[PDB]
Amino acid sequence: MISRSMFDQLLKHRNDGACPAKGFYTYDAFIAAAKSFPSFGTTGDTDVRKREIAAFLGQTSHETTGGWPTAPDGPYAWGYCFLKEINPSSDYCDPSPQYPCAPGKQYYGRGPIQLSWNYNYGPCGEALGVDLLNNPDLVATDPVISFKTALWFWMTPQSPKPSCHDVITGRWTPSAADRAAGRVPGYGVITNIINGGLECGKGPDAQVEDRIGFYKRYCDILGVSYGNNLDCYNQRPF
């Protein structure tokens, strides 16, 4: 587990006035959230535990980045700047008898994984013990819940698609079809899990490069190797 000083060095600009999420993403909220998922950051040897935190913070930093190319400390120091999706194009409501949209509510991206859609807020809240279908705004008002939604995503498989956790800790072994699709363990298949439909299997991509930039900077500061297969440029989406 990373210390407060390390967390603050990785996420160095999140509390700048420039960032809408200033003050929200506290180290204490991160540690409290992680307690609900005790295998997070505790699975594997010392390098794997650090790498899991780097990979989780890298991907979520991309989803919340306020960086730009000439920014102080570079663009990979501007993770966790945003809390809420900027200019959402809809309510993100896909009505469902299992997940019915609450009146007046919107399911645009919120928190470190930019949780989106009623049918993601629904099962996430159920797993956390919180009604996020009916109060989705909790993901942008309660920082412990906010971090918990991102850890829920990270830790929950959509079998046969694996959890990000299982990939980075070595607990996922690709099926033969996965191998035929180019999906092998590494940060690249984590990008594929998170947004592969739009970002993977099509050559270089500025979004993927941003995810990797954060991960590399965090691995550098934590003192761990990146692992192999960092991109998904040659992977079929799941």
Residue numbers in the entry: 0 to 237
Q: What does the paper behind this entry write?
A:
GH19 chitinase hydrolyzes the glycosidic bonds of chitin, namely beta-1, 4-linked N-acetyl-D-glucosamine. One of the physiological roles of chitinase is to defend plants against pathogenic fungi by degrading chitin, a major component of the cell wall of many fungi. By revealing the evolutionary history and loops appearance of GH19 chitinase, we discover that one loop which is remote from the catalytic site, is necessary to acquire the new antifungal activity. We demonstrate that this remote loop directly accesses the fungal cell wall, and surprisingly, it needs to adopt a defined structure supported by long-range intramolecular interactions to perform its function.
After we confirmed that the tree topology did not change based on the presence/absence of loop regions in the MSA, we used the tree based on the unmodified MSA and selected five ancestral nodes where InDels of the loop regions occurred, designated Anc1 to Anc5 based on the presence/absence of loop regions in the extant sequences. To get structural insights into the emergence of antifungal activity in GH19 chitinase, we first solved the X-ray crystal structure of Anc4 and Anc5. Crystal structures of Anc4 and Anc5 solved to 1.13 Å and 1.57 Å, respectively. Overall, the backbone structures of Anc4 and Anc5 were nearly identical (RMSD of Cα = 0.478 Å) and the orientation of catalytic residues is similar, suggesting that loop I and II addition/removal did not cause major structural disruptions. All five ancestral proteins showed a similar level of chitinase activity to the two modern GH19 chitinases, while Anc5 also exhibited antifungal activity. However, removing loop II from Anc5 decreased its antifungal activity by 12-fold while removing loop I did not influence its antifungal activity (roughly 1.02-fold increase). These results strongly suggest that loop II has a role in enhancing antifungal activity. Some of the 45 substitutions support the stabilization of loop II in Anc5ΔLoop I. Structural comparison of Anc4 and Anc5 revealed six substitutions forming new interactions with loop II regions. By fluorescence microscope experiments, we observed that only Anc5 and Anc5ΔLoop I bound to the surface of fungal hyphae. This result is consistent with the result that Anc5 and Anc5ΔLoop I showed 28-fold stronger antifungal activity than Anc4, suggesting that the acquisition of loop II is necessary to access the substrate in the cell wall of fungi to perform antifungal activity.
